[PDB]
Amino acid sequence: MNNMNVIIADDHPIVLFGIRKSLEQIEWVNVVGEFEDSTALINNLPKLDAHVLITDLSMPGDKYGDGITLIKYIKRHFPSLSIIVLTMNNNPAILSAVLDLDIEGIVLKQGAPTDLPKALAALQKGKKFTPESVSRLLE
């Protein structure tokens, strides 16, 4: 596939290792940055020239925040950047509000082990990789 500069952002290092373990088989991926905090993510985002961001939803960093506020900030300040949300919060209202921000993918940590590789493969082909929130939201 086309070569891709990836930044990964999660406040759990073991999750960051897990992303690297899953992506080490994929040669076209270049992990140009790893961050545990949204301040360090935003300060480094201009300097790295990244095509994709694999971001955690619940994260420390008071200056730029986390979740919806952070994704809203990133898309307004870094419009070329593609965002894959990696979260364990599968709440219908949070997933749908995240979907309304026009992001490229959501991967649940509760889901299948091959979802994060498959989401990057979908992004390369210009397609979406997201779970449906509305049915559970409506309940």
Q: How many residues bind its own copies (CB under 8 A)?
A: 20
- Rounded to a whole number, what is the distance in angstroms from the first to the last CA of the chain? 39
Cβ distance 86 to 116 under 8 Å?
yes
Interface segment toward Mg ion; rule CB under 5 A; list 29-37, 43-51, 55-63, 114-122: 55-63
82-110: b (≥16 Cβ within 10 Å) or e: bbbbbbeeeebebbeebbeeebbbbbebe
Q: How far is the CB of 114 from Mg ion (least distance, A)?
A: 19
| Residue 58 engages Mg ion in binding (rule: CB under 5 A) | yes
Residue 116: which of its own copies, Mg ion, none does it interact with, CB under 5 to 8 A by kind?
its own copies
Residue 62 touching its own copies (CB under 8 A): no
Q: Based on the shown chain and the rule CB under 8 A, indicate whether residue 7 belongs to the binding site for its own copies.
A: no
Residue 57 identity (one-letter amino acid): L
The residues that touch Mg ion, with contacts defined as CB under 5 A, are: 11, 56, 58
